[PDB]
Structure formats: C-alpha cells, structure tokens
Design a protein around this ligand. Structure first.
Ligand code: NA
Ligand code: NA
Lengths: 353, 353
C-alpha cells in the first residue's frame, strides 16, 4: 500500500556565486546540476528513509531526463515519457545567504502532459495508497482527478503549494485535501484564493501565529484538516481541525517520542509550534520537500502526525546541509536524535475561538 | 592535416523569464541549454562546414558533460575527463528587456585541468596541424605550451580573445601568434598589455579604423601577423603585415566549401595592409556564437585551401548564420546560402591602406 507521489520531475540548475551577483554581467561561483522537483524530491526522501513510494510523473526523451534517471532505482511505470515532451528545468541564482536571488521555471511540461488521462491509469495505486501526495505543479484538472480518486477510496491527500502562484490551485480541491504544507506567503495566497478576493497580505511565535490564524481558519473551514506552516529557521506550525491524531526503520522514534507526552478533548482549531534545529546551511533548496518526505514516510510507517512532523523537520535539517535537494543518504541515528530534540521542544499555542 | 582546436567546452544556461522576476522564489519562463565555449563553438562550426577538427579540452564525468556531449560526433581523445573535474557552466538569468539580471560562471576547470602536461600528449597532432586555434580560456602556461609546439613546426596559430580580461593573456605568446580576432575592447586591452604604458582607453569605418591603427600596430610590432577586428554590425577589419592574400601552406590533396566559394569569390579581384569587410543584414534571434562562427568559418575556409580574403568573407557569412540561429552554432549550414553571402561580403570588401 505504497504512498503515491504525483508531481514534477525537474532538472535543477543551482548557481551559487562566490561574491554578490551583479546585474549586467557574470560573476565567479559554482554551478551544479541537481535532481529536483517537489514530487521527485519527496519520493527520493521517502525512499532513502526506507519506504518505497510510487512515482507518477512525466519526462522527456532528452538529456535532462537522462540525468534525472541515471541512478533511478524506483519503478518507472508511473512515469510518462514521450519525445514531444521537454523535461522541466529550473534555473536558480542564489545569493551569499543561500537564498534564491533569481529563479526561472521551466516546468509547463507537467501542466500540459501530466494529465488526468495519464493519472487515471493508476487508479488502483491511488485507491490502495497509504497516502496521496500531489504538488501544485499539476494543473487544476490533474489535481481534481487525482484528489477525487483518493477521496473515493478515503485516502488522505497531501497538497504541497510549491509557490505563491501555484498555491492558489487549492481553490478547486480543498474539500479533498487532508494536509497542506505552505510557507507563510503560500498560506496567504491560499487563503486569498479560497476567499475569492485579496483579503490577506504576507517577531515571536505567538505574534506570527496570531497574524496567520485568520488565514489558517479559512483553509480549515474549506475542508482542509491539517495545515503545516513552515517558518524556515523558526520551525513549523502544526494546525489542525480536531485532535491532530484523529485528523488522519522508525521504532526508534516511536520509543523516544512518546505518544503519551502530550496530555491534551477535541478543539475546532488545534495549534502547536515545532522548533527547528540549528544547522550548517549549504543550500536551503529542498528543505520543504524533505519535510514532507520525512513526514509522509513516518505516517506511512504507522507513526502519528506529531511524531512524523518531528521526523520531517529532522529530515529538513539534513537537507539544508547538503548540496543536493535530498541528501545522498540519511543517518537514522541522526534523524532519530534530531527528531527527539524537535519533539521534546514542541510547544502548544493558545480558550475560545 | 586536421586543424587543432584547444580551449573551453562550456554548457550555457539561458534563463529568459515570462516576467515578474522576484527574490526568494522561482518565476515562470523558459530555460535553454546551449553547447558553448569559444573552442567548442569553433570546432562545431568548422565540422558543420565540412572540415574535421581535433578538439582538445577538459570535461567532467557529470550531468552537464552528458548534456554537452550528447550530440557530439567528433573524437573525444583530446578531451580530458575525470571525476575530479566539474564541467564548466555559465548560467545567466535575464530580465524582460533581455539583459542579464544575475549571472554566475563556473569555468575554472579549463584553467585548472587543461594543463601543458595534457597538451603535450597531442604534440603529434599540433605539429602536423594545418592550423592551430587556441582560445584565451586557456591558462597562460597552457597557451605557451601549445603555441610554442606549433611555432616549432611552423604551424599557424589563431588566438581568440574570449573577453577583455582574458585577451591580455596574449602578452607572453604574441611572438608565436599568427592571427588574432578581437573586438575593439579586446584589441585595446591587448595593446595595453603589450605596451610599457596604458596608452589606450557611432563612428564611420575609416574613422574607427584610424582610431584603432595605433593599437593594431602594437600587436604587429610584437610579432602578430594578422589582426582581425570584429566590428559587429559594421563588419570586420582585416589588418596584416604583408599582402592580405595569404593562404595555408598545405598540399592541395579540397571540398565543397572551397570550389563553391572559389568560383564565386574570384581570387583576381585583389609593410601594413588594411581592409574593411562589410557584414550582411540579418534576422537577429541571438548574437550568441557570432564571433566564434566568424572564427570557425574563416578557419574552415583556410583549411580547405582558400586564401585569407576569401576565408574571412565566409566567416562573416557564417557569423550571419549564427545570429539567425539561436544555438551558439546553427544546427546546420546551408552551403549555398553561405557561398552567396560570402560573395556579397567579398565584393563589398574595401581597401583602406
Ligand atoms: Na540542500
Ligand atoms: Na545564435
């Protein structure tokens, strides 16, 4: 009952300049190819954590596809390859921060060729899936087809907003979505999209949460059960409608991250903050994807959402310390240790909605 | 026999956005890969014109190399490939205007790994070459080793000034160099490098020539035999020590480019000699590769037995084909079109001195 991952397979071009990038000319630095795309990264992360995912995507019969598939050890029956299709490419120019200064995509092969027609071939896989994860690179039509299959079989759906623009695609599928994982810009865009108007616009944790609470409520009322807001270096917010456990390799995590840790019996809005762990950043790209991958893998292994999120945040830290979007391997003892640190450090927010 | 091409093999990455370039995230647009590097471009241009060159360069055993070499149909024995090497890449992110918003270049593989030691492996190739073409991407040591090998065997050397900065690498090898092909910024930079002081720092053709004559003479005084100043849309300037109608001292036993051009570009039409060659009006799609194909077209023509005046005309024709292509080098050359354009340039050529 493998988790099913649907979305983009992208060849990433990462340009980290030695000095500050200046207009009108090139500056010295390093430029690397990295296997990318939210869905590909999530699948890769889940696999390296010891769970086999099923990948549904589309690739070309070109050079970039041959880079992405060189060391691909998962099934490829879910991957649509034809010659008319041009493999998606994202080109990023970083700053010295490790943040993106300028990026271009690059990815309309996904919206045009990862169709409902292709996804419906795998109705059994989605139906029997432990979890369905879709990224917003999919078209509204593909997202509808995907999410309606999982809902039919009562399979929980994870929607990754990918960007501010593409996050608005939550609008037509919100009912079917169980979990979303936006940052604070994407959360705002999603809230605006469901509100049909531009009602929301993009410090301490209780300030940030109080500022995002109206936007979070919008998503919850539109049928989303769990909203995970990634706050980068100040961790993540886990917000859910009802008890977070009721909303939906790792027996180490189950041991040390006790499910009996949190005494709190079913609120309309549940909120708690997860801290992140200090890390030696080489590239922040892929951090969010590994959070999702780490979380899905744990949920797929029978852990609850609170335990799974800690694993996700652990995986995110490992990812920023690599020059890949997803690290070449995961060290389980490191993953478990970091997860416990995050888990034990998780605190609850907020007595009347 | 075969012309030897030594220099950079670069993967060019052009990111031209739909619009709205913003920090912190990817933005919609198109990203293209283009096989680049002056030497690689010259080699490709020469081959498509029906002459086989020998390429000496350095590449990695990575993804960029596999994109770069995918449709490479020439020998690879002159190309140093090792796991230590990361394939040179120039990554450019444009704005709506078409100017570079941010650019990063990682091309230190050429200067660090294309050593004199590697070049001396192909001493037989360089010695027996009809012509030797080196780009300024090479280190000074690599340039010295290559050009002194050619000088011993009296093999003509073509030095291509990659940029204003790298053009100054002519300083230690000017003695060995037969032909240089700078634009006028590069010509000034090379002149200053050769001089004991920095004496050099819209216009009509004989006016622009009269302004460049001192800088041109400097190069001539230092041993350069032929100076070709590329003037973009104002054609090219051909200045030489002695008669301009020079040819490659190679036995007759030719090809299709030779007897097409020779028929149509009569050799009976035509110290220091100076000519101006006009360019041909063209549908510019991208100026990419224009200078390189001017070099490529001229070398190819010289290699098939044409004189310098005939060869330069082909080069400007080839340069035109390159600007009306949007690969650095056009996918193919239509020899009839090249020949027709060459006659236009040839017949439009004017004596200045
Ligand atoms: Na990373
Ligand atoms: Na071009």
């Amino acid at each position: 009952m493998e988790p099913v991952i649907i979305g983009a397979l992208i060849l990433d071009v990462h340009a980290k300049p030695s000095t500050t990038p200046i207009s009108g000319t090139t500056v010295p630095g390093q430029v690397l190819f990295a296997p990318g795309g939210v869905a590909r990264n999530v699948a890769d992360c889940i696999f390296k954590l010891g769970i086999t995912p099923f990948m549904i995507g589309t690739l070309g019969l070109d050079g970039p596809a041959n880079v992405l598939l060189k060391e691909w050890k998962l099934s490829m029956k879910g991957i649509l390859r034809r010659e008319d299709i041009s493999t998606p490419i994202v080109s990023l120019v970083y700053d010295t921060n490790g943040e993106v200064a300028a990026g271009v995509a690059g990815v309309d092969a996904v919206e045009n060729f990862l169709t409902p027609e292709w996804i419906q071939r795998f109705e059994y896989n989605i139906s029997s899936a432990r979890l369905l994860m879709v990224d917003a690179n999919l078209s509204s039509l593909a997202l509808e087809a995907s999410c309606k299959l999982a809902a039919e079989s009562s399979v929980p759906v994870w929607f990754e907003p990918v960007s501010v623009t593409k996050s608005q695609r939550i609008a037509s599928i919100a009912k079917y979505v169980t979990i979303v994982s936006p940052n604070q810009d994407e959360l705002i865009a999603m809230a605006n999209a469901l509100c049909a108007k531009n009602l929301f616009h993009p410090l301490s944790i209780e300030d940030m949460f109080r500022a995002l609470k109206p936007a979070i409520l919008v998503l919850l009322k539109n049928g989303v059960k769990v909203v995970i807001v990634t706050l980068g270096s100040n961790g993540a917010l886990l917000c859910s409608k009802g008890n977070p456990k009721k909303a939906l390799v790792f027996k180490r995590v189950q041991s040390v991250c006790s499910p009996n840790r949190f005494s709190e019996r079913s609120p309309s809005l549940f909120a708690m903050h997860f801290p992140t762990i200090p890390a030696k950043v080489k590239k922040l790209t892929g951090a969010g994807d590994c959070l999702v991958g780490g979380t899905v893998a744990s949920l797929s292994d029978g852990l609850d959402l609170i335990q799974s999120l800690a694993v996700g945040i652990a995986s995110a830290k490992a990812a920023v310390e690599s020059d890949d979007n997803v690290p070449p391997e995961f060290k389980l003892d490191l993953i478990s240790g970091d997860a416990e640190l995050v888990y034990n450090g998780a605190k609850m927010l907020m007595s009347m909605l």
